[PDB]
Tab-separated table of C-alpha atoms in Angstrom:
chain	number	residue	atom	x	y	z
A	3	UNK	CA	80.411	97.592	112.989
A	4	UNK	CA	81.011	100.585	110.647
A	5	UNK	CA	79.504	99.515	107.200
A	6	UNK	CA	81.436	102.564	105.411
A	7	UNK	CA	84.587	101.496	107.014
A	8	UNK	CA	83.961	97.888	106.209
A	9	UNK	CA	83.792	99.360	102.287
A	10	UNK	CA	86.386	101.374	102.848
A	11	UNK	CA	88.788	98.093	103.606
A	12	UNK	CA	87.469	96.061	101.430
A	13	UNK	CA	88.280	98.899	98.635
A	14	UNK	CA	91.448	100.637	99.916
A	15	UNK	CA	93.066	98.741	102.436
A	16	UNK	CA	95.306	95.847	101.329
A	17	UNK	CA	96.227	92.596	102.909
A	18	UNK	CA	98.926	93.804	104.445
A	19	UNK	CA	97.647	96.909	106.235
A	20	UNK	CA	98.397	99.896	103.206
A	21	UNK	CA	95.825	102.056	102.113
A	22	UNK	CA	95.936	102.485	98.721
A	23	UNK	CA	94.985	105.413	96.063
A	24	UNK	CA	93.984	103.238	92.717
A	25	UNK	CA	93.171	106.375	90.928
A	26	UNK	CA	97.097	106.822	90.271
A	27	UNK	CA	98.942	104.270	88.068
A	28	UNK	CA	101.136	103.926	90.492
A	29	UNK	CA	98.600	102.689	93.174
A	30	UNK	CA	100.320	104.910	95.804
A	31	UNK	CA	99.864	105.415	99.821
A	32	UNK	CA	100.721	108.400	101.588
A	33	UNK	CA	101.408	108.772	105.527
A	34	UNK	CA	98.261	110.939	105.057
A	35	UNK	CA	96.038	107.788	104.314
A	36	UNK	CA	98.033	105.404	106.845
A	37	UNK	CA	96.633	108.196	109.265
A	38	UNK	CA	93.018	108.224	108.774
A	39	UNK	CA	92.857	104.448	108.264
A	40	UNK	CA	94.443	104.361	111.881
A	41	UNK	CA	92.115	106.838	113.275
A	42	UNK	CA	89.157	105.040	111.438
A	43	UNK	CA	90.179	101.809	113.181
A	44	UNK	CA	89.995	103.259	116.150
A	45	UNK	CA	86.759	104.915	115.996
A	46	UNK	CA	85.694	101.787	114.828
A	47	UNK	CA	86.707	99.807	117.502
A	48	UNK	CA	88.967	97.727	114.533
A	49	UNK	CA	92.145	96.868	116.322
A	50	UNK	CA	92.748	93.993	114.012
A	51	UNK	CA	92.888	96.893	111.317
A	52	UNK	CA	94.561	99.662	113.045
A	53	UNK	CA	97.711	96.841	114.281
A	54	UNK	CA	97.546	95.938	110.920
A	55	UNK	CA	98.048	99.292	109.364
A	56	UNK	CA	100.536	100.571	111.872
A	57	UNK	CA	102.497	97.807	111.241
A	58	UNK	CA	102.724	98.462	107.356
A	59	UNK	CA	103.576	102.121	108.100
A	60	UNK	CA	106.370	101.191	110.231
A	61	UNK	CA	107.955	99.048	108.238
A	62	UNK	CA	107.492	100.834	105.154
A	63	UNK	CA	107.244	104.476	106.058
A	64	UNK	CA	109.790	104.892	108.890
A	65	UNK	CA	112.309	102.422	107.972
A	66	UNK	CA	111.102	99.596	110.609
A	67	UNK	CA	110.155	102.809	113.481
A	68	UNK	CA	108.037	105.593	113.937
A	69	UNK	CA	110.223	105.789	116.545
A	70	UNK	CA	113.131	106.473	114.952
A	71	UNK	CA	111.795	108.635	112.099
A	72	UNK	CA	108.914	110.503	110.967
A	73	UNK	CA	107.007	108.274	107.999
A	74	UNK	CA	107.665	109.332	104.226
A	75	UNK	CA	104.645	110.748	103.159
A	76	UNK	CA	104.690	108.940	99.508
A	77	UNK	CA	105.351	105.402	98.671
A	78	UNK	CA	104.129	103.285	95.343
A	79	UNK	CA	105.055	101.600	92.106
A	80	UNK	CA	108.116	103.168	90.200
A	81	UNK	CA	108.902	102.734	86.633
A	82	UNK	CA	110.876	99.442	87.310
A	83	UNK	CA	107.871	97.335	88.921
A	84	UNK	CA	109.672	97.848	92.115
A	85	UNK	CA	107.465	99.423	94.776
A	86	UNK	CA	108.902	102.130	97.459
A	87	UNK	CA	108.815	105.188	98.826
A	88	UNK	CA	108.842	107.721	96.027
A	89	UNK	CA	109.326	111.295	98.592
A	90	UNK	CA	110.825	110.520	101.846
A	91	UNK	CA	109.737	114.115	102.872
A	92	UNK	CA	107.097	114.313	105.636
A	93	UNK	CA	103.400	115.435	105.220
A	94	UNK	CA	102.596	116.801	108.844
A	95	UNK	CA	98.979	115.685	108.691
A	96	UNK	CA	99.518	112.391	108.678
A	97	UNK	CA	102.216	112.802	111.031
A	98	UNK	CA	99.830	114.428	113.350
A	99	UNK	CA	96.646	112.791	112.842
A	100	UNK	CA	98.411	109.652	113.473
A	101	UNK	CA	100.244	110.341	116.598
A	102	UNK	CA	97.034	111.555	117.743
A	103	UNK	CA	95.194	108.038	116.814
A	104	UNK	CA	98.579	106.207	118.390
A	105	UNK	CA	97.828	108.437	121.726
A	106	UNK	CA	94.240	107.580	121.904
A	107	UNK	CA	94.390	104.276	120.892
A	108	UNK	CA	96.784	103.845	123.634
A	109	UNK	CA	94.454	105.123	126.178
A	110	UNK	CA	91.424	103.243	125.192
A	111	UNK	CA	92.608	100.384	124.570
A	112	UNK	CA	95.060	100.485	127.468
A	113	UNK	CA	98.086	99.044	125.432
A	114	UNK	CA	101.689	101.277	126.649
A	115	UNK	CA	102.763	99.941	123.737
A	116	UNK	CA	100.995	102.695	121.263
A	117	UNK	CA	100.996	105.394	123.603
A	118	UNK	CA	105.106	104.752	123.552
A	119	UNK	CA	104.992	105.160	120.030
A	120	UNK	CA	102.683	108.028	119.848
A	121	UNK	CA	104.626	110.144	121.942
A	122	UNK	CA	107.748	109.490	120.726
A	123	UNK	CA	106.201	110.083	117.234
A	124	UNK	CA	104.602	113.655	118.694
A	125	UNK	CA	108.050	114.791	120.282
A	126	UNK	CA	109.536	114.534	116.802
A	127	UNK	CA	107.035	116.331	115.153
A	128	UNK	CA	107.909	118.938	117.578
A	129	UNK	CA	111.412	118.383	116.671
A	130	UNK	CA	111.571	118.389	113.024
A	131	UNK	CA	108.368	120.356	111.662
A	132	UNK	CA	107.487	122.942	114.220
A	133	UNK	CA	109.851	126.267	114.391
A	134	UNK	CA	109.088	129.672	115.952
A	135	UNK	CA	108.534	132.320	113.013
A	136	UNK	CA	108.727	136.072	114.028
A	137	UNK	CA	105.696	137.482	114.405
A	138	UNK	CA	103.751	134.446	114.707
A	139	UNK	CA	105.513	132.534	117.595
A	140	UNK	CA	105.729	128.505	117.389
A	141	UNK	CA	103.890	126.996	113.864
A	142	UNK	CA	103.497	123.592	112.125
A	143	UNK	CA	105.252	123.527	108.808
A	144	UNK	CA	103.738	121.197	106.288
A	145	UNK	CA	106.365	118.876	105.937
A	146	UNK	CA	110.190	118.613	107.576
A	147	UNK	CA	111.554	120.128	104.379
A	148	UNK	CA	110.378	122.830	101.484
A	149	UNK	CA	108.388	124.485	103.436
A	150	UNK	CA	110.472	127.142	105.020
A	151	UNK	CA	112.861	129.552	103.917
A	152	UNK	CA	115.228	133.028	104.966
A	153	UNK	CA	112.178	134.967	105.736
A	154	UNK	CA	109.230	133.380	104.519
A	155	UNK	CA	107.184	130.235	105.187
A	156	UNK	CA	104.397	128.415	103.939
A	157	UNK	CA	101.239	126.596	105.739
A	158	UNK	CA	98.422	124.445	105.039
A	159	UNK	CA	95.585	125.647	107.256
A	160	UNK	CA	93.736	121.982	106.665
A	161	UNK	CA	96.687	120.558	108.369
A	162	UNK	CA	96.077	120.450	112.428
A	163	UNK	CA	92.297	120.251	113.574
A	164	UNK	CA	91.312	122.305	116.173
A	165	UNK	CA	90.562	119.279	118.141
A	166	UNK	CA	93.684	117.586	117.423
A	167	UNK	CA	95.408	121.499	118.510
A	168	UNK	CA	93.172	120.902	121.603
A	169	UNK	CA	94.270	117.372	122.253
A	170	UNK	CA	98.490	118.281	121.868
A	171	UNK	CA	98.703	121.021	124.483
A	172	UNK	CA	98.845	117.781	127.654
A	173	UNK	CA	101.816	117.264	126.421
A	174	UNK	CA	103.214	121.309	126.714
A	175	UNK	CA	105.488	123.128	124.671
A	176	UNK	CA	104.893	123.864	122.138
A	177	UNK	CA	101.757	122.489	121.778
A	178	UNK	CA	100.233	124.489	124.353
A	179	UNK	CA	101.361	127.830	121.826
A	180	UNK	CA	100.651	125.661	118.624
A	181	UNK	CA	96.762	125.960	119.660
A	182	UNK	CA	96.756	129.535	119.832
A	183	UNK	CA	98.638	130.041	116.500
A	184	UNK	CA	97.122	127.621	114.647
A	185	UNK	CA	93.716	129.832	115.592
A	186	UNK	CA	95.718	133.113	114.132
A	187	UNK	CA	96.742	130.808	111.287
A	188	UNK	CA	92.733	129.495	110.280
A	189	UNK	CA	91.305	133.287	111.455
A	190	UNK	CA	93.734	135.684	109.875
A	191	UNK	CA	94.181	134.193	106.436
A	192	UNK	CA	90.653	134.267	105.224
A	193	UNK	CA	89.523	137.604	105.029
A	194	UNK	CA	86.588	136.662	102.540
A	195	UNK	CA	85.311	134.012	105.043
A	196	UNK	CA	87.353	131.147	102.203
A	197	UNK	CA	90.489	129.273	104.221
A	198	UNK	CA	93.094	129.137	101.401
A	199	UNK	CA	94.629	125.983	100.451
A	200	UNK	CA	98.146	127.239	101.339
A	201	UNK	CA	99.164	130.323	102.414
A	202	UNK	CA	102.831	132.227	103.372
A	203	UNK	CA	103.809	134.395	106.073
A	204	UNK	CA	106.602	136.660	105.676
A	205	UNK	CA	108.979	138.420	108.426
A	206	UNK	CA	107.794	141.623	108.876
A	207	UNK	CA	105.533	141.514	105.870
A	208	UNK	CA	102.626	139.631	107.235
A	209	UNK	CA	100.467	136.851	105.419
A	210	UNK	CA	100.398	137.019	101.813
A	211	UNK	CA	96.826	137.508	101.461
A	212	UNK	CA	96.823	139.136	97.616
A	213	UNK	CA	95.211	136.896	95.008
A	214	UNK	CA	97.548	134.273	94.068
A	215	UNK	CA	97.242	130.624	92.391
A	216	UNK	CA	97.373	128.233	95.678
A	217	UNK	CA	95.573	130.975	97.842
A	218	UNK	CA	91.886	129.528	96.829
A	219	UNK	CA	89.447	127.203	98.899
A	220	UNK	CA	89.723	124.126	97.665
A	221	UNK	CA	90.339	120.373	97.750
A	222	UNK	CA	93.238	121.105	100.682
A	223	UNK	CA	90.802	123.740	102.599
A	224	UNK	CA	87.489	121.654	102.311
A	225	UNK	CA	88.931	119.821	105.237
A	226	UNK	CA	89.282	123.366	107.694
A	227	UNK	CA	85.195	123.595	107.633
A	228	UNK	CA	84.559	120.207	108.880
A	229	UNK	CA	87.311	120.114	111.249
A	230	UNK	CA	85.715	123.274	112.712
A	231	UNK	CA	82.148	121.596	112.523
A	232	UNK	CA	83.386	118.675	114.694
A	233	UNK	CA	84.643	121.297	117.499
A	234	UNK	CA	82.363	120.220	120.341
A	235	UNK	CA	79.822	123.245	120.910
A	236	UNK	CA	80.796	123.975	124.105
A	237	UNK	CA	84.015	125.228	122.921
A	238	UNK	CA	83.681	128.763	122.651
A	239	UNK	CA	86.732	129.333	119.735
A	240	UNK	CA	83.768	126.996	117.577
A	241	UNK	CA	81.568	130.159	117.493
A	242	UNK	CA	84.194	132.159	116.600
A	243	UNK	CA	85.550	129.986	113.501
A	244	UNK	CA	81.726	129.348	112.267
A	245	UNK	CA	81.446	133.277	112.108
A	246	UNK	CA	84.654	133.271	110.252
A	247	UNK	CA	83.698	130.850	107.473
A	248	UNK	CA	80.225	132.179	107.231
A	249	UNK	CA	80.247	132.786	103.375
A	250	UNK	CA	81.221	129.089	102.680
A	251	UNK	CA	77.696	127.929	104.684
A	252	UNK	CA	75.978	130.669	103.141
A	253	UNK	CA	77.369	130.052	99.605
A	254	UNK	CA	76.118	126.180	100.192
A	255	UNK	CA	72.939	126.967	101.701
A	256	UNK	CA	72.015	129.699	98.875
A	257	UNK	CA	73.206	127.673	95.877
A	258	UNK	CA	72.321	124.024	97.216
A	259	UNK	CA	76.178	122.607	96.664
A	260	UNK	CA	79.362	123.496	97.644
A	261	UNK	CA	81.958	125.298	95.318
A	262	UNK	CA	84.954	123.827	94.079
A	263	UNK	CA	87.229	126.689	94.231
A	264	UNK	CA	87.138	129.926	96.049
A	265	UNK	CA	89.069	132.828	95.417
A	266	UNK	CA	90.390	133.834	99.086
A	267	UNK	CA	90.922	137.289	98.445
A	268	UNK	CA	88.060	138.175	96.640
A	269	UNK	CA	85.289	135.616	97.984
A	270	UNK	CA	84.578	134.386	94.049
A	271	UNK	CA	83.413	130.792	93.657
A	272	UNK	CA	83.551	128.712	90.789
A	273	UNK	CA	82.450	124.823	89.701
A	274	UNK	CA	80.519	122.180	92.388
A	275	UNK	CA	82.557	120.197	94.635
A	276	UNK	CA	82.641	116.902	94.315
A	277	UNK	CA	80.488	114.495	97.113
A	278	UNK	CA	83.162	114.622	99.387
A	279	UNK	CA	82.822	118.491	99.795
A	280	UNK	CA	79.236	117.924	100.243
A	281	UNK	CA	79.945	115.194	103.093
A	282	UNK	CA	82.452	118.063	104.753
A	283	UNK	CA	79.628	120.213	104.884
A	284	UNK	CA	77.489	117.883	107.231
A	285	UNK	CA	79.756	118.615	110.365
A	286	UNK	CA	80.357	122.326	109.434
A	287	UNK	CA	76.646	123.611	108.375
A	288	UNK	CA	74.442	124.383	111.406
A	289	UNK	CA	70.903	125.238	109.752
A	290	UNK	CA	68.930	122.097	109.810
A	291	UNK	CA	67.833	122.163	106.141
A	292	UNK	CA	70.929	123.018	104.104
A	293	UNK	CA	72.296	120.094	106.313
A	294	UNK	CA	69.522	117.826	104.655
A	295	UNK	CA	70.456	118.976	101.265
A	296	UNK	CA	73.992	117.769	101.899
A	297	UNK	CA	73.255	114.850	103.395
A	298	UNK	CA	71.059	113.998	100.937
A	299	UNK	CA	73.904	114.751	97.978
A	300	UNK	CA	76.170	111.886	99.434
A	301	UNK	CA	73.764	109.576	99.906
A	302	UNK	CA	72.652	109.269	96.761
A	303	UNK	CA	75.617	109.873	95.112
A	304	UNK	CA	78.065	107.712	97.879
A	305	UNK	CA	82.088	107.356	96.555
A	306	UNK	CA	82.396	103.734	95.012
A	307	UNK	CA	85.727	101.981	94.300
A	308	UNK	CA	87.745	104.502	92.440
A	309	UNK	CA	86.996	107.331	94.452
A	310	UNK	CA	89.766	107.135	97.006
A	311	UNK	CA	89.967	111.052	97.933
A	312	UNK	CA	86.000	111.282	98.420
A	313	UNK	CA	85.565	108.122	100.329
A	314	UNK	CA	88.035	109.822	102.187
A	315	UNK	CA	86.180	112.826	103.342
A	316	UNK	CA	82.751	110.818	103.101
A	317	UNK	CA	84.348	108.583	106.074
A	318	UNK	CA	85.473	111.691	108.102
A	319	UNK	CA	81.759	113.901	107.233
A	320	UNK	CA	79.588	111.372	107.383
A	321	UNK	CA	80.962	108.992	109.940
A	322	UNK	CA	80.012	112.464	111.812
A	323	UNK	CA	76.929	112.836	110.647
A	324	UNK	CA	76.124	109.686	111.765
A	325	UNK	CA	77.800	109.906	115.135
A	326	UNK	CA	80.822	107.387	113.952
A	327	UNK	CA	82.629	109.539	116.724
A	328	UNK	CA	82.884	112.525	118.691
A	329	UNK	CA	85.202	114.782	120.318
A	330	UNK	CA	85.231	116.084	123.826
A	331	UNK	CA	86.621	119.443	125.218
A	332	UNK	CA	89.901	118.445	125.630
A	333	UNK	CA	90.255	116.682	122.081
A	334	UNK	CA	89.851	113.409	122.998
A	335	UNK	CA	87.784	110.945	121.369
A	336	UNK	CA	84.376	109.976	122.845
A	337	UNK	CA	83.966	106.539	120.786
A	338	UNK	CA	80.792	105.200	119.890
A	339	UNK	CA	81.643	101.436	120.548
């Protein structure tokens, strides 16, 4: 038993398997939060949950099949009482965050059935969202559509974990690229030590690395420092990211909180993150004590009922923190059952 993922259901998770934002009048879900209530399930050892949410993603996301389609990423209450999806565009870290959880859950539980369904799910990912970009070689886009254009695209570096990048390259091409560039992607775009929200690349140009509204560290980017603190430390790419990001431990450890926003291209930090930023920390930060601050910050000040997005990254930080799960080398889950 998990007690912040027995919470977490009780609060978020409906009847019928949907995990639900109530901080939005329309009481929305995203394939985003189908994802980590899957993987959640799973590192809880929850199978009643996770069948339970796959099956309300399938039927409501993809049409009936995550077979046949990847899931919309937005679906809630519109103006006429009627609820459905509101974007049928994708949001790739759901997509991959729950083909990952289908391909693990498929392996530890030893059910065919989810691993069919996670790699059918992966291979149109690979389809749909990933395209090669001059200069860079094979990338994830955020999303099947918007997201790329003659000449320039954009990316979300929060969007594939390294473990996750780790996990993918079994399966080949182009995973087995995707793990190198999504290292260029996370090292090469903060050159204050801040991992922007978002961030184009341009043919020829490069990445567009001048100050710019969505190029800031901030609710979207929270997520790249605790993916990197979950790395296992064996894996020698961990050192190299924790050097990277140095200013965002140092910034925490020196002022006692993390920032909200950080300017990427000039390393200037405004405002205190909100308790999930602090729980994101816990993974990421390596000294002892600045840990304890952190960990100290969520407890006492632990997301209620209306606080979807930092129960959210509480789950993920925390759950870590208190060895909810681990990765191993290769990106596979090592649960704690």
């Amino acid at each position: 038993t998990w007690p912040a993922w027995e919470q977490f259901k009780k609060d978020y998770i409906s009847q019928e398997g949907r995990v639900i934002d109530p901080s939005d009048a329309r009481k929305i879900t995203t394939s985003e939060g189908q994802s980590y209530g899957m993987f959640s399930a799973l590192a809880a050892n929850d199978r009643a949950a996770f069948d339970n949410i796959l099956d309300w993603t399938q039927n409501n996301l993809a049409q009936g099949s995550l077979k046949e389609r990847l899931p919309a990423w937005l679906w809630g209450k519109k103006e006429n009482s009627k609820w459905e999806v509101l974007d049928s565009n994708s949001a790739s870290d759901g997509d991959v965050w729950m083909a990952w959880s289908l391909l693990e859950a498929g392996r530890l539980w030893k059910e065919q059935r989810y691993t069919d369904i996670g790699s059918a799910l992966l291979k149109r990912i690979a389809r749909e969202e990933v395209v090669t970009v001059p200069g860079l070689g094979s990338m994830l886009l955020p999303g099947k559509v918007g997201f790329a254009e003659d000449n320039s695209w954009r990316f979300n570096p929060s969007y594939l974990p390294p473990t996750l990048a780790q996990y993918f390259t079994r399966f080949g091409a182009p995973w087995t690229t995707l793990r190198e560039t999504n290292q260029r992607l996370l090292l090469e775009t903060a050159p204050k030590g801040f991992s922007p929200d978002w961030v184009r690349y341009e043919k020829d140009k490069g990445w567009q690395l001048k100050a710019e509204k969505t190029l800031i560290s901030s609710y979207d980017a929270i997520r790249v420092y605790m993916w990197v603190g979950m790395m296992p430390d064996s894996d020698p790419q961990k050192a190299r990211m924790l050097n990277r990001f140095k200013p965002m431990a140092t910034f925490t450890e020196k002022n006692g909180y993390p920032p909200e926003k950080v300017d990427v291209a000039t390393g200037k930090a405004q405002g205190k993150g909100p308790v999930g930023f602090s729980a994101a920390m816990l993974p990421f930060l390596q000294n002892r004590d600045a840990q304890a601050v952190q960990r100290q910050r969520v407890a006492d000040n632990f997301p209620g009922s209306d606080a979807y997005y930092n129960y959210v990254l509480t789950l993920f930080g925390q759950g870590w923190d208190q060895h909810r799960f681990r990765f191993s080398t290769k990106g596979e889950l090592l649960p704690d059952w």
